[PDB]
Amino acid sequence: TGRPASAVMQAPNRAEVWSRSQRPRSEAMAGPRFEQTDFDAQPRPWAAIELIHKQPVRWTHDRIVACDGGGGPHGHPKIYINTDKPEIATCNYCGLPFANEHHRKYLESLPQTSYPLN
Amino acid sequence: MSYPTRTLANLRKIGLKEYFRQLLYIGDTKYGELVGVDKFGNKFYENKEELPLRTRWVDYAKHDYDAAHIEPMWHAWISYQVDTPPTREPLTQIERPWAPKEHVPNRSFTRGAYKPYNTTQPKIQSWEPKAAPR
Amino acid sequence: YNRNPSPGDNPPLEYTDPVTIPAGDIADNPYWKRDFRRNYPRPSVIAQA
Amino acid sequence: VALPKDAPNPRAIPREPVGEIKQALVNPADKYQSKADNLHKYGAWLMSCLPKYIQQFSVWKDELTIYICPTGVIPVFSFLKYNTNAEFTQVSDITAVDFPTREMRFEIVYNLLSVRHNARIRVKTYADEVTPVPSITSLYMGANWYEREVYDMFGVLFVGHPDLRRIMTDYGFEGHPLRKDFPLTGYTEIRYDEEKKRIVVEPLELTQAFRNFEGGSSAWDQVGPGIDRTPDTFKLPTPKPE
Amino acid sequence: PRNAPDYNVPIDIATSTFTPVPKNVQDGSEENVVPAGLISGAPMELQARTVRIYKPAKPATQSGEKNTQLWRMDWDVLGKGHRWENPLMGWQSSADFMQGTHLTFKTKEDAIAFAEKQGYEYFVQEPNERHFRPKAYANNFLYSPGKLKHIRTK
Amino acid sequence: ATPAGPPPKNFRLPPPKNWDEESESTIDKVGKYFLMTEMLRGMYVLLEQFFRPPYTIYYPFEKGPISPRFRGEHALRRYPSGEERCIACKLCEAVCPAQAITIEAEERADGSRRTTRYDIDMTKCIYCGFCQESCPVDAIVESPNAEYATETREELLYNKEKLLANGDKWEPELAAAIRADAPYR
Amino acid sequence: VQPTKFAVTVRQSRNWADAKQRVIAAYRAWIRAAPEIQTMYSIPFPVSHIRTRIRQEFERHRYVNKLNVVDVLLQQSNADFQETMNFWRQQSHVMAFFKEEHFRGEKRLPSNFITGFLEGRN
Amino acid sequence: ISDIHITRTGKPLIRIQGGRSSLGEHTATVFGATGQLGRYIVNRLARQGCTVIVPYREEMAKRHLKVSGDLGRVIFMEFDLRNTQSIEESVRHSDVVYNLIGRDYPTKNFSLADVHIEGTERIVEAVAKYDVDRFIQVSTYNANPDSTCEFFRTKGIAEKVARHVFPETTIVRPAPMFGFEDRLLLKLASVTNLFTSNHMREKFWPVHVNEVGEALERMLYDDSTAGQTFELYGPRQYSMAQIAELVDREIYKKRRHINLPKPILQPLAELINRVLWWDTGLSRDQVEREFHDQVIDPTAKTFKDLGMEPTDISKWTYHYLLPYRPSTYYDLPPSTEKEMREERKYLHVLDDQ
Amino acid sequence: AEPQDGFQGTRLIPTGADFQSPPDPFIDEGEDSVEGRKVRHYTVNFGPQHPAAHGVLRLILELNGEEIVRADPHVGLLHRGTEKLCEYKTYMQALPYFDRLDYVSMMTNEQVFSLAVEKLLNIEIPPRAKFIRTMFGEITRILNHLMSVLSHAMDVGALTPFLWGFEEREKLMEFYERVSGARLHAAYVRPGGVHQDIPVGLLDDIYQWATQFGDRIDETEEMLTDNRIWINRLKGVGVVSAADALNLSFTGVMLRGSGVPWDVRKSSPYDAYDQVEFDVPVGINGDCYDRYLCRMEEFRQSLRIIHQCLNKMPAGPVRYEDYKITPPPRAAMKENMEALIHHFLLFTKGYAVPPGDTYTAIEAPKGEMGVYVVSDGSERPYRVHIRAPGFAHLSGFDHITRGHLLADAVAVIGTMDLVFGEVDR
Ligand SMILES: NC(=O)C1=CN([C@@H]2O[C@H](COP(=O)(O)OP(=O)(O)OC[C@H]3O[C@@H](n4cnc5c(N)ncnc54)[C@H](OP(=O)(O)O)[C@@H]3O)[C@@H](O)[C@H]2O)C=CC1
Ligand code: SF4
Ligand code: SF4
Ligand SMILES: [Zn+2]
DSSP states (O other): OOOSGGGTOSBTTBSSOSSTTBOOHHHHTOSGGGTTOOSTTSOOOOOHHHHHTTSOOEEESSSEEEESOSSGGGSOOOEEEEOOSSSOEEOTTTOOEEEEGGGHHHHHHSSSOSSOOO | OOOHHHHHHHHHHHOHHHHHHHHHHTSSOOOOEEEEEOTTOOEEEEOTTSOTTOSEEEEOSSSSOOGGGSOHHHHHHHTTSOSSOGGGOGGGSSOOTTSOSSOOOOOTTSTTOOOOOOOBOOSOOOOOOOOOOO | OTTOSOGGGSOTTTOOOOOOHHHHOSSSOOGGGSOOSTTOBOOEEEEOO | OOOOTTOOOGGGSOOOOOOOOOOOOOOTTGGGTTTHHHHHHHHHHHHHHSTTTEEEEEESSSOEEEEEOGGGHHHHHHHHHHOTTOOOOEEEEEEEEEOTTSSSOEEEEEEEEETTTTEEEEEEEEEOSSOOEEOOTTTOSTHHHHHHHHHHHHOOOEETOSSOOOSSSOTTOOSOTTSTTSOTTOSEEEEEETTTTEEEEEEOOBSSOOOOOGGGSOSSOSSOSOBOOOOGGGSOOOOOOO | OOSOOOTTOOOOTTOOTTOOOOSOOOOSOOSSOOOHHHHSOOOGGGGTSEEEEEOOOOOTTOOOOGGGSSEEEEEOOOSSSSOEEOTTTOOEEBOOTTTTOEEEESSHHHHHHHHHHHTOEEEEEOOOOOOOOOOOGGGGGOOOSSOOSSOOOO | OOOSSSOOTTOSOOOOOOGGGOSSOHHHHHHHHHHTHHHHHHHHHHHHHHTSOOOOOOTTTSOOOOOTTOOOSEEEOBOTTSOBSOOOOOHHHHHOTTOOEEEEEEEOTTSOEEEEEEEEETTTOOOOOHHHHHOSSSOEEEOSOOOOOOSSGGGGEEOHHHHHHHHHHHHHHHHHHHHHHGGGO | OOSSTTOOOOOOOSSHHHHHHHHHHHHHHHHHHHHHHHHHHTOSSOHHHHHHHHHHHHHTTTTOOOHHHHHHHHHHHHHHHHHHHTTTSOHHHHHHHSTTOSTTOSOOSOSSHHHHHHHTOO | OOSEEEOTTOOEEEOBOOSTTSBOOOEEEEETTTSTTHHHHHHHHHTTTOEEEEEESOTTTTGGGGGGSOTTTEEEEEOOTTOHHHHHHTTTTOSEEEEOOOOSSOOSSOOHHHHHHHHHHHHHHHHHHTTOSEEEEEOOTTOOTTOSSHHHHHHHHHHHHHHHHOTTOEEEEEOOEESTTOSSHHHHHHOSEEOOTTTTOOEEOOEEHHHHHHHHHHHHHOGGGTTOEEEEOOSSOEEHHHHHHHHHHHHTOOOEEOOOOHHHHHHHHHHHHHHSSSOOSOOHHHHHHHHSOOOOOTTSBOHHHHTOOOOOGGGTHHHHHGGGSOOOGGGSOOOOHHHHHHGGGBOOSOTTO | OTTGGGGTTOSOOOOGGGGOOOOOTTTOOOOOOGGGOBOOOEEEEEOSSSOOSSSSOEEEEEEETTEEEEEEEEOOTTOOOHHHHGGGSOHHHHTHHHHTTSTTOHHHHHHHHHHHHHHHHTOOOOHHHHHHHHHHHHHHHHHHHHHHHHHHHHHTTOOHHHHHHHHHHHHHHHHHHHHSSOSSOOOOEETTEESSOOOTTHHHHHHHHHHHHHHHHHHHHHHHTSOHHHHHHHTTSSOOOHHHHHHTTOOTHHHHTTTOOOOHHHHSOOTTGGGSOOOOOOOSSOSHHHHHHHHHHHHHHHHHHHHHHHHHOOOSOSBOSOTTTSOOOHHHHTTOHHHHHHHHHHHHTOOOOOSEEEEEEEEETTEEEEEEEEEOSSSSOSEEEEEOHHHHHHHTHHHHHTTSBGGGHHHHHHHSOOOHHHHHO
16 A cells, blocks of 8 residues: 555665564555555654664773663663673663674674674 | 733734734733744743743744644643753753654644554464475 | 742752661661561451350 | 732742651551450450351451351341440441352451441351342441442342342343453443444454453462461460479 | 253353354253352353363472462363454454453362352363472482493582 | 540530520611622622633643643653663553553564564553553653544554654653653652 | 332242242233333334243243242342333343344354354354 | 355455454445445444445545444545546455445536446446456446436446446345435425325335345355346335325324426426535436336346345334324323223322422 | 252241331321322433433432432443452552542542552551641542532532632642642552652642632632522531431531531541641531531641641651562662562562451541452452442432422532442442
8 A cells, every 4th residue: 555665664764674573564554544645644763773783882891891771760770791702792771782892803803793893 | 811901011012913913813912032933933932920821822833723733842841841941951952863853743634644553463374375286 | 939940840869769777778677577568467266166 | 920028939948958767667567456355355245145146256457357147137237236335327338259169159248337436347247149148228228229239249139128229230231240250341242333223232342352461470479377466365275384 | 962062042142153052051950059150140151161170280480389279260262252363453352251261269179169050061170299209419429339320510 | 426435525505596585686687688798798709809810821822730740642762872762571561550552572683672562552541650660761651742632543553653753753851751750760 | 119110129939839929920020011111112023022032031940940049030030120111221221132133143053063163163 | 154255356255253343354345335325234344344445525424434343444535436546546455346326316516427327437447457356336226228217327327337347247226215314214204295296106116225235245245146136126016105105104194295297397396406405305307207117127136046035114114203203192092981080099280389 | 058958948037127126105206088199200310311410320200299209319320340350450550440439539549548458568658658648638638629519519500619619629730740640540649658759849839829728718608608599509408317327328528417526537547647637527407508518617627737737747758668569769670689670570460468358448528438458368459349438328319308309409419429430430
């Protein structure tokens, strides 16, 4: 029921679904109920998965890093992240990337990373 | 309920054209200082010598004025939920590239009305029949 | 004077969440001494016998 | 605005600082032990005065419960109404509780008030699907609607009740909704049908089924057995050593 | 006629397309049993459906045994009408008015007595019990006269 | 009726007074009757109110007061980076007194714990704030908005798209309301 | 009587002879009222069709051999009778009692095994 | 009759039979559902959990249709019969399309040919473009393209157009229908005077509108009704006079018809239709229609084929006209001697009040 | 040996009829003749479609000309199955169900359920919570009496006081919205205390409203108390004697109007009512006029209590300090392991309540409100039964109205403080 890009794109900043059980917008907004409708007027929030991966890697020398979202009481419960593996460590609440400085040369060697590194 | 001295004074401060226009939408003779303008073009005013809860008011940009036309942060200000107008509100300055750029009014009774739908895939998948050849 | 300032402009840092020191101490409050829920009275039942 | 001369800004008065707040730990059950003996004595005296019908009594905090057989409902409530030391002349509430594990599944609960003595009492009897209870409408006019509610929600008959009919459910409603075996959304539902030009009853069909999170109940008991608070005047003596 | 389904039972207003055909409806003449299902107001369907009477097993994910203490009475899910996907929201619709109902009993004779009285068909699942075996910490360190056969790691 | 013990002092009323014993003169008695003095006094009260300021505000040009705690239209919020705050704990779905929330979740493509379905049936919701109280990350909140009456009931079945768009539009209010009341939460 | 029009005080039956009189008395009042019931709720059926339903309702409980259960059924009959003869019921309530006026029919269960199986459990 | 329906084009419909929340699987468009008969087909589909597309012209007119279905089941579409985009936006998702669009009088905007012939032709062409499975076209009794009567004539060509564009068209020929909100029973029972230029001598076999609506539903379920034609009529023939006898027999009022002669009434009927802005029940082609007599085609499927037995109109007059019989105390027949005697057991005035 | 003993009907159970004693006759004070002619009564339905005094009320009256013969209220038009739903909720989840019973007296409704659950929890709530709940209790009593007295006045024709007093309602509804985020259904009083503390400028704003509320009461009394039309509409109407009021289950003003000095706040003190001073208005003639005067004086005693609560408000926590019952502060929940677990469990499982049962009553604005809760030891209540004063009062409508004029029925419907969410639940 949708020709325009608002009716096909999963989000303005991402064409594709980001979970296996996610219904593609093209099939979700199809059928009789979407016939005489403005599609740009429909709610289409930006995909959070694309936005969090623009966040640069917060480098640290310490092995363990605390993350609470940065709002103090306005964030998430404080958790502690281990950066000892040679990879980008990510907060399981807010998705923020963290990496140890010991792994900077190997991470810079990597062809493509999950996070910009800069 | 304006009273003579109030209405006569506001008339002098605003002029008869403005007076009659104000009488065409709000039905009162109000005058105050311009606090600011929102994204949709609504103008917001304050006067602390008015009656309680009448010290803040909006002049709507659109003839068919609707209460949902008010920009979010201004909605808090006019409803006395905050005292700092959005013109001085730091939380209005955080850059959110995902934030809606044009104002979002209520879209009911139009063809932009929100249509709900299932956001998930079917729970069960049937076999795709493959007749084996003889 | 009335609702001035608006409650939405009350400075958040001023208000302090209070803690009573027996219940909220870090030193001398074992939970079992103030566990009045688990010390609930059983009903006292008397039959004809 | 024109302010009142003697009404200054009440927010502008500074408040004295508050420091280390200290609140003692209170067991709220302790304050009732002062009357624990008296409540047992009153229950015991009632049992002695009406031994033919009073099976047991219980005292929890300041609440005295009296447990009776259904046949004694009229004699027991007559005594609680008219006795000079029991002037429970108001029925606060009559209701029922369902216990399917019991043969007499219905527990009938009466709460009484004595304004003269500033006291309350609870009387419990039991009933079944086919075993009625005496109506107390001849002793208390207020009891009339409470018994209709028990009959409506639980299906309990009150013999001697005038005009025992439904009070809460729709006319022609089938079932007693406060039974544990009666399901939450019931059996049927209504709608307006445009062919019949009237409302029609149909089998119940929910667009979203009720989700029962009862299975999230803690796998560990969280309350424990509690504390015994029987007074000494109602505990048996013990043999001395040697 | 020896568990034959009575295709001529009278219906009531709650009889739907998902109601099973009963075998035995109460008439008030059963010996020694109160016919609650005849007077309860409950639909004919509950005398056509089977309940399960069992002690819930301890979850494999926890050691607490609180929910294994009591006897549970539960209705079996039918072939049709228990759940389906609502086309609008994807919610899960039901035609089974007993789906979210369970009863708790102190003993299974109580559960059986209630089920016989209402006229439910029932099936009693007895609880599997643990087989006792004494355990000793010192068995972690028994002397092995022969090849070790297993290397323990505390 | 009276409490046990001796009758309260002076509980018994004195005997009724006859017409003869009334301590009020005939002229006053006749005058009030024929002149309707207390009715005239009540009318005079209305004139006093006739010249007092009215309490009326001119809605929708003016609005009544609301607090940072006000419970209105639901919204889903983000972090400053734009990542969803919601991690599919299901605390709001469990506490909901009306069963208005339905949630489904799996691992996202990046392995993050996120929702795939987040619906709120606004025709089931009792606007109690329990979800907002139960949320450990401030993901579900009630906005101050109350002016969203709809033409059809289907427009009140909010899915995740509708709720995340609401959070994007209302975020500066949502942060201001959280900023003012978080010390008390 | 005294509380409202058709109010019957709840009493137990003394014996089976007492119970039978009440059951016949209850049936007699029901089938007598059938002409009034038709015109009072504008039922689109003849009094013959209504009176048959009365007998079947009494025949579902013909085999009851327990006195306490009879007292329960008698109390239900009086309650239904009062709320019918008083215009407390609405046409929707009485019409729902006639199983023919459901848009899926009156034979709401499968005739035999194979019709229910071919349609999908009825 | 089962959990599986396979449509003309093969779609399997796994259906959960039930009520409002159930899954009927069919998507239907019903043109002209805002009239007398459209409420019985829309109601039957929606309450089985089928999706019904309702194209409408006046918003306030279609408001009652939404109550039939669950949320998301009754869908409204703004439409004009001369807006092709609107017709085929209402049809491209449907597996069955009902055409109930008709009008007994011409209007300033629509001739009988414009609404029937051109109306069907745009709809039927939309049906074939999107390969709708079943296109049920509703028509009239006496539908014949060689008739002088434009009503019957324009119902004739539209049959031929529909069957040409879409050979599997199912044509339904209902006789004048009675029932709730009909124009037979209430028209006789309500208007003080009728201008009938034939002494109410036209005969026909009235059929309940409920049964026509039920029949329309039954054709959806059997694929054997495609390419067929259905004359749908009641058991016994009546005439407008004999039915008026029943009406008068039930409301205790005497019918009065002026009965102006045909050469004078017919031009007047034209004038009234061109100056009054509503259905006056009177027009030129309607005066001509009253001389015609319903002739039933013998080579057309009946209710028999659908497993139905129409009821006679005299069974329904009392039900549908009961709220129109006076019930004032002034109008009861005289008191019996039994009644005269019992009055003397009561005081008939309160003397203390 | 029941109920098989009833299978063949032995030993009928004794009724109240089997205990009717003949009165002592010594001291017991109690042809076509037109006197034998019967009088036919006409039975009129009032409501809910045809306008009534207020609410979902189908009142079926048998009349003799202008006089009431039998009064038969049909209720259940607002029966929503609240008591059954509470068995599928946690104690937290059942609390909002109490806002919607007497839905102009929300905080005292939730107060009675909190006190009953606190009693089975065996916890003593902090002193500040006690004073906040008592303070909001009397604010809610004024809100209720403003609705009750003035809408009762509007029913008998007095339009103006209803307009004046509902601006007072608007001012006090702001206090409800400032503490919670709701005008009506605050869900503010919970077992353990109150949801959150009051904002730091509320007490002074309540105080400012308090300095002007006495004048609002007085101006209401200027239109009604001495008005001869008001007196002639209320005096001698809806009389119930002190003895019958007790036997009919009448509580609150319906009981105190008949001369019985009884207030639950005095007889069984709860929260902070033992720490405050107030008087109990009591009538002597048991009529609508006495009950109107008691309610007007209750306005002044409520304001008198509120002023004492403003000055006696202590510092400290507003929620019982055990995170096994009350939710931890959000900063604690995001900071330490123990608090986060207790937050998770309280919002998914709920707190477990020790097994037992209790009947707990308060002096609600409409009279004695009680709740009977049975706990099975789990996190869901086994049984919640609500004792609504309006249920007992409306059950007495026939007793107080039989033999009286149809033109007085609106007076006694209004003299009972009747909200049908209370009556039907
Ligand atoms: N009723 C009878 O006894 C008989 C009827 N028929 C046929 O039966 C079918 C249904 O009959 P019935 O329901 O009683 O008829 P109605 O007159 O009650 O309804 C006819 C429908 O056609 C629609 N319609 C008419 N003209 C137009 C137009 N120009 N453009 C768009 N829509 C239009 C109307 O919509 P709107 O409401 O907006 O005008 C209405 O929904 C019709 O095809 C009719 O000709 C034939 C023989 C007998
Ligand atoms: S909104 Fe909050 S409470 Fe609900 S699932 Fe998301 S994170 Fe958990
Ligand atoms: S506000 Fe209350 S009812 Fe509404 S979704 Fe949140 S928890 Fe559920
Ligand atoms: Zn983080």
